[PDB]
Design a protein around this ligand. Sequence first.
Ligand SMILES: [Cl-]
Lengths: 455, 458, 468, 456
Amino acid sequence: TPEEQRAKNAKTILENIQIYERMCDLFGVSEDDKLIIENSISIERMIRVVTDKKVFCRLVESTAGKCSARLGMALKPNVEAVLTDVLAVLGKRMGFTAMFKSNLEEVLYQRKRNAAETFTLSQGASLEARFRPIMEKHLGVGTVVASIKNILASKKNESWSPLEREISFLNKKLFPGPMRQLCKKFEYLNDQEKQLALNLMLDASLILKPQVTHKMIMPWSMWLAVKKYAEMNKGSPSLEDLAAYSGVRAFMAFNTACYMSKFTIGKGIVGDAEIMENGNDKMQTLAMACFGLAYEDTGIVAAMISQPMKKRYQLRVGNFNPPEEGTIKGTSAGYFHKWAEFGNRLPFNSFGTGESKQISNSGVFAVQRPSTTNIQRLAELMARNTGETSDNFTQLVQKIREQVGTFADQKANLREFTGGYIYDITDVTKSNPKIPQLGGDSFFFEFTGSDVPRT
Amino acid sequence: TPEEQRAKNAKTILENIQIYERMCDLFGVSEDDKLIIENSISIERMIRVVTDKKYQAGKVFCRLVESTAGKCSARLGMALKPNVEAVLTDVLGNEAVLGKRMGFTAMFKSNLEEVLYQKRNAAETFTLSQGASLEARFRPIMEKHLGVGTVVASIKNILASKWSPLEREISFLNKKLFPGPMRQLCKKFEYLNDQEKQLALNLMLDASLILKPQVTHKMIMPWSMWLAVKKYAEMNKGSPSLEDLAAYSGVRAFMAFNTACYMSKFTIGKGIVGDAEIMENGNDKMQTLAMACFGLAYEDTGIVAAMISQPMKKRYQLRVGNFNPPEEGTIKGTSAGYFHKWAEFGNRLPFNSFGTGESKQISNSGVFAVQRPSTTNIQRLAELMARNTGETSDNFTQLVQKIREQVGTFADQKANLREFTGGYIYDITDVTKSNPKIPQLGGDSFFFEFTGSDVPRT
Amino acid sequence: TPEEQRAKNAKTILENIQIYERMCDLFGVSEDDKLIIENSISIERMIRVVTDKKYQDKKLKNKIANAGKVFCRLVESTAGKCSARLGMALKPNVEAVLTDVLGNELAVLGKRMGFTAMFKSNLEEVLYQRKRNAAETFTLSQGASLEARFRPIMEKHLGVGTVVASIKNILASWSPLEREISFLNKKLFPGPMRQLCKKFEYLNDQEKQLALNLMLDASLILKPQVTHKMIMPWSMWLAVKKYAEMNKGSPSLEDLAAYSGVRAFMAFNTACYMSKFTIGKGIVGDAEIMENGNDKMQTLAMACFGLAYEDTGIVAAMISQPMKKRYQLRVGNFNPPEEGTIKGTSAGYFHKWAEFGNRLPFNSFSKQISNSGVFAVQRPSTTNIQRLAELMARNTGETSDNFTQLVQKIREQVGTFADQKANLREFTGGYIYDITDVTKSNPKIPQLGGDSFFFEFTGSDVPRTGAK
Amino acid sequence: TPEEQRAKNAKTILENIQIYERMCDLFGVSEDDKLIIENSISIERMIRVVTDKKYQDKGKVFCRLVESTAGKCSARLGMALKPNVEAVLTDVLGAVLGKRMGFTAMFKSNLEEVLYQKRNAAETFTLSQGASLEARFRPIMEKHLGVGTVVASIKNILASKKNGNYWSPLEREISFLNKKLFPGPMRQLCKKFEYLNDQEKQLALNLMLDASLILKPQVTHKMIMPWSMWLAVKKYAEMNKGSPSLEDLAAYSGVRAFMAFNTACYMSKFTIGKGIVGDAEIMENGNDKMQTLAMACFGLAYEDTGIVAAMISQPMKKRYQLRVGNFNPPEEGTIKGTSAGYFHKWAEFGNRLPFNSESKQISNSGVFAVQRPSTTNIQRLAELMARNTGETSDNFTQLVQKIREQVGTFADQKANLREFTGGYIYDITDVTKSNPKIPQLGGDSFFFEFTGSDVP
Ligand SMILES: [Cl-]
């Protein structure tokens, strides 16, 4: 039952709000300043540092109508004591905080062992090693490949080894076909053959899209803002009503959090330390971080938000650390006027209504007609159905190139997430599907003439 | 001679009408209720069950529709097994002939089941599974009507279960498949190992979804509808005779179907396939009937839409039941004149040209040094090279690759690929084919697409 | 020198006119009936039969006087009507006429009879589509009707299919095979097909058959180079001579003594002032339908220029009558009818002309195909993909490639040009010109489009043809 | 440091001007006539001939020069004894000489490329930058050489081994070719060149040469002018001191090079005579010769003509519409001044791989289940896989096949192919590059196209 899962989420969310508020108290954050997102980022960072098997924390304080950085200090036992009073499961909840931090850094910075152009496949790249197994489904192909490369580099200087676990993770994500067969021989390949297999599977995934799990992960501060709004506005949805990490209720949760949430505007953006931050640009950065939208088609995002969509280097945004001096600004409520489901399966597969199994016609009448076969679906079928087992490493490499080629040759007609639509935020029943008008540059990290000087 | 073949057909049709009427009497069906299609479906099935060696307690039971007024109800008819067999002997005599006539009833039933419902083949190959419902005993007789997926399923069953059955099915598959390495692989199929065999079948099956095979199509309607054709011809002097309409192809078949619908009947009840609480719609059942008789489930919906007298609906927009006798319902007449346009059957390779208006010229040889685009027909050239450049020293791995490349070559031309070039639709009154027409195609052509206008819980 | 070459052509044409007129006299053809094209076809055919010593030696072996009797079916005109007659002459008399005009040597006769055979082959191509080769390769069978003795002499005029057929006959039945392979190699589009020709003798019979059919199929897009000339019946050249003599103001015979270029079109138009053909009952296909003069005129025009396999849009833009597809034409076999009417040819049939494309069509009719960037300025790629592919066809051959590898590379070459089909252009730089524009000052491009196949079945076809 | 490097360039330019003026004096060229470009071409040629040890080892130096008598001009033979010329250069100069003469040879090669279009196929000639250079100058000017030129050098070496007529030279040339070629299997094939057999070597060279016509190689470009034009820069700068200095304009690339060319054109001179390459009876045109001069100094023969036309102040003409001679001193003719301000727009040189740049994002990773077309950039994906997915176990046949497919992939995408992404032309005053402009392209971009407006 959906309500069963929301009740479970509300329990976890209420625990996180309790931890956040009590930790803020322990570090001397006023009740009003608990709603500043910078403080949530810093508090969550401190918990992750302390709980990794006498504590200072950089924080924002509101003063004289402005904001200023202060260094909060607590006894390490008191931090642990607050956690004990409220509370594997801790790993998951902190795994999520790390994932939001990774998704924020993906928007802010493009950032080793993988080619620069594969960076849009590096979801979860900021996660520390301890959180990677827990958040495995959220990690991109590039992130797992980098971990595999790290293991291999560590070797050159148990029934389930870390490398074997990582390979199993990659196999599940990869587009079906010869890439999955190549994973099965990874242990039998030499070091150079391993490097080639990894870079080939990574390059091919830039068109043969992998399956990656997406959730709406926002800072604890914003969940606190949902709770306070729910208590203050009686006709409003409850926290359990909004205790969803996907679907329309997640968008309602984010928009509701934006009524009371706060962030800081200061001197210094990423790139130039002398340029002033802009409120709307920081709002867009916050929205993109909470939904992991850095690598998403900007046209899709632009069709759903209440402000003009901007490319990365047109945004005057800082690092979300507490500024030494600045102004506090409220988040914008109603930022998302349209919503959509997450695509957590292979993008070339169907999602929703457009999921019939008919991909061809068999003619009956001798009537001239065009061929109607869905070439994309046929190519996917043959990837799953016509695999040769006697293929060696060289042969698998070749069919991976050929698999990339057949979809590249079809690029103009390739469709991802067929049957998926955007819906108005009021349209919770999904009764009126809409299709965004896409076109033009869809890359968030494109350089433009409207970019910020020095950035 | 065309008339000789209609005369041959009329004799067979009249024998089937006799069998049907005598079986109905033996099972207590009123004369009016003989024209209910559900009763034809159930009687024909019972004949197949009785002649099936495994199951058909000395009495034979058959569920049937009975009309009380403009109302209908299901009843269980009963006859003795020897009496049912005696009727067949009386009409046909016993010494073959029965197999083919039951094969055709089985083919209609399969085509109806294909419309209503979409083991070893991948789900996406289901549009190549014409005749999939046929019991094993009827497949060799109806071989040309079977799709590539159905033959492959038979081959897979043979291989897993145990002038030869395998050679028969392989020979059948070779005739149907698009020319080229797939036929070469069929010829070497016996020399492959089990793993190679399974890959070859699935590869040839996937490729046929674009490299269309050749399948024979006929207009196969229930005996009751043929009875309706006879009754209308007898009742109306201006109507064509049964022998005039005794055709399974061509315009006369469409006229036979349209004429049968003057007097044929079906039932409207509560409960459709998918939702047991929704009421059936008469027009939706009519479309289902029309599609079943012509085997149109897997056909381009745009083609079908241009020939029928009602707006074309996708599968799950249809409020249609299983065509079994409902416990309670109303009787509805079939719609006469349902096909306002007709076409010939495409029983040959779709990528080949069809009928009048084709030719063997596929290129120009330039004479004058005048700038011109290339005019070569790439589709026809690819098919020519498929038939002309076959290598016998190619092993399994080489043939598999050439199959992928052949799929790739046609996938590259999709935008320019045409099937049944030179084939047109004609008005039902244009029996001479004097006014060829091209249907207005566009949009999704898949009968089984899910839509937003679908029936709740469907 | 153009004038020098026209002088040589005039001498040869005048020799052919003498032979024709003397054979006509020897076979009792009236002066008016010498201008009937049917009589020219039959007389030239009779010379080819008389000059075939294998066939004549066969008759000699298999009495002698009958072998010495030569019969020729001919047209006789009385007023405006015509009838068939059988002319007879003794073989020594026929040979003596050839010896008197052409001398004792009689390689001299081979080329001239090769050309007459080529016109006849080109007429049969228009009338009939054609089975050693697949039916769809018939548009590559230029010169298919030529007897074996004429094929080496007319080699450059032969299509890839015709040479392939000759090779297939040899296999089923310097060196004859090596000569034919060398002919094919020169005609074929450059690349792996030419490499395969060089290995043909080391292939077995099964590989030989596959290679031939593969090279033949690929040529339907990888167009071979074939030599084209304007070849007319001797009677039509006679008509040029008589018109030139009667009308001094008109261009001279040497002025019109060209087998290509605008002067060839002028020669054809000049021949049409006085040339004649027959209209009778019976067309190819139906023996009860009457021939139509305009349809037969189109057939004659197509035969003289070998246009059966040409893009009909090109041809339609150059002729003075609506262009008709094959099976819309009411035309007979050009043999003498038992009864019929005499019809004049139509003057001015060609109002536009063009040069012959005798080289690889994918070549142009400059050598820069790419740019090397100097300034860091955003630009589209400007490389000519068609010319690039052709260059790689000529330059990137692997020698050690075996039969199987070459077969694959031929398929890939077909595929590569098939992928470019929308942008492929043949005879780039070639244009049509008005018959008066002899300087080529006003180039024009035909508005092409629609079906370009002369042998298309249409709904407007003649009963029992395309509607059969 | 940019300004440090500009001062060093001024030192090199000033040394070259000295040599030119001293040789001019020794050969009797008047100061007015020192600015005639034909005299600079001839003096530089004579220096290369004098210093070439390969000719010497196999005693009077004669030089054909232009002499002006007011507006009119005439050819004259300057005369010096070889020891006299040899002594002057040793006195003037006292390794460095080779590079300066390599640059003079490069200008002459780029002039001949414009004027005139045997081991490489004719259609590969647009890959033959630096083809005229003598063997001694090719290693020094390696970065300036085209793929066809290096391949031709390799073919010559191989042919001398086969005939038996004669870092090894071949290894050096292969290393040169490797740095220029488009990344991927072509570079892999270069590294195995010594391990290929003779037939494979020939196939590899022609394949890499043909493929480079679409997979463009990397070639270094600099603005190389005759010494006379640098002398004209010095004279104008000193006489009009309010104008930029020589050291300010001592640049071989960037906007300063274009200004140096424009500044040199105030006082530079060339000859107009009767007789062009082609027909000896047709008169030379100043603007046609001016275009040839501009193209030579920037090596633009093989450049997109639309690109060039958008930057110059005169209508762009194709090669065979130009009435231009061989730039040797004519027997009789007229003197014409060069046109100042010929380039009203400028651009940076593309000395890197043209298909390289632009951000590094070439794909999207979907988040929302929303129907969308694939957005992946096929061109850049292919470039990435060329650089990332290289197999060392690939044999010759496999590398050849991947080269054909690499050519095929870019051919299939030609309509979307972009070269020099991010490069724009700028106004001659826009030294800040503040206002980018895009050339209005379309139509034939080939300088050597045959046209109906061509010269008999
Ligand atoms: Cl001429």
